[PDB]
Design a protein around this ligand. Structure first.
Ligand SMILES: Cc1cc2nc3c(=O)[nH]c(=O)nc-3n(C[C@H](O)[C@H](O)[C@H](O)COP(=O)(O)O)c2cc1C
Ligand SMILES: Cc1cc2nc3c(=O)[nH]c(=O)nc-3n(C[C@H](O)[C@H](O)[C@H](O)COP(=O)(O)O)c2cc1C
Lengths: 200, 198
């Protein structure tokens, strides 16, 4: 198996899958504009049903006139550490398809497909030497109103991206959590032939 | 800017993001059991809200007693080509959690998180020299029934995984589509400061 990033996999996974993680101690430095565009470019190369590409990204750099708005759209707990990230953005998805004639049909996969784009985002960030950190502790209705998100678009998650620094900058409770998370055994989620896992 | 796999990126992305794609011409060869486990192990390392890990994967190898069933759970247009993949599986997500005291709570991010696991699956497949192909043209209610999926678990997608072969094996309409797909300009989906698209 693989040993990497204080994690051990049961099978020889690429170390990239263990090395990608979501810390909270960010150094508050500026990220080059092209680096963020590369990250979002990788994200937008994700697969999606019918190649509909339902994801959207609304982003702000730490030097933005709207940085404080992006910070205050997160819940207080997340603000405490995410305010020191280099970039904040929201991952959004179109919850329908719309035709040339403006006819709307509910999308069965838009959130799923947005998640693929988000992993791609996190992976590209990782590859450039950054860490991305997903957030659901966010004010979704305020995001929609303040960021002019049109009807039929869903806020999936916030994302903080930055350069990792020493945990000492964190309050003690977060510093204690600054360690890569573990996973359940593969056999608890991967079943041959039929669903053999417990329902709970 | 990056050029790879008959695709061109606007920004210098890792060529892995361009090289990963979803062909339909598969060679029907057996995939080693450990290779599929490595793929799903990568998938299960995805991030998820609260580290709930809501994904499940139900899989069969082409050599399987279950293969005919797995093939028949795909719509006909998918069967035509996916029946020649090495592995077929369904990505499933748990739509809820339950407290110590028994209170069921809907999960807001379970499909989104499953999607992250699916990209991870597809990327690890790619890195081992295979190709994964996602499928929504599937019989979900029949999948739930036949594969004994419990209540509160959602079928997200089918996935075919295998080893690419010459497109000549495909019917013409699919042969024409056996090329790496394109994307909208980045600026059409990435907006600074405010949502400005459409
Ligand atoms: C959609 C989603 C929402 C998340 N929301 C939060 C959050 O609001 N606050 C937080 O500290 N972490 C949040 N996370 C981080 C997860 O807890 C983390 O990704 C998970 O524990 C796995 O750890 P890893 O990403 O380091 O592998 C979220 C992750 C996902 C993908
Ligand atoms: C959830 C989803 C559902 C899909 N359903 C089908 C389908 O049923 N039939 C098919 O041939 N391809 C299907 N695909 C393939 C997509 O059309 C394909 O991933 C997209 O055009 C982008 O191409 P790429 O993955 O080669 O980069 C599906 C993909 C996604 C992720």
């Amino acid at each position: 198996m693989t040993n990497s990033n204080n994690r051990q996999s049961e099978y020889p996974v690429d170390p990239l899958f263990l090395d990608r993680w979501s810390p909270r101690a960010f150094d508050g430095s500026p990220m080059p504009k092209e680096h963020l565009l590369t990250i979002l470019d990788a994200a937008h190369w994700a697969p999606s049903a019918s190649n509909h590409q339902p994801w959207r990204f609304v982003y702000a750099h730490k030097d933005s006139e709207d940085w404080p708005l992006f910070v205050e759209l997160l819940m207080e707990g997340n603000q405490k550490w995410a305010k020191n990230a280099s970039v904040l953005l929201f991952v959004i998805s179109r919850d329908h398809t719309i035709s040339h004639e403006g006819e709307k049909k509910p999308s069965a996969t838009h959130s799923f497909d947005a998640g693929a784009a988000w992993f791609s985002l996190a992976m590209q960030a990782h590859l450039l030497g950054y860490h991305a950190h997903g957030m659901g502790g966010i004010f979704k209705d305020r995001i929609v109103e303040k960021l002019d998100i049109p009807d039929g678009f869903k806020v999936e998650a916030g994302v903080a991206i930055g350069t990792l620094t020493d945990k000492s900058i964190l309050p003690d409770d977060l510093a204690e959590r600054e360690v890569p998370s573990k996973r359940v055994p593969l056999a608890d989620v991967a079943f041959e032939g039929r669903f053999t896992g417990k329902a709970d």
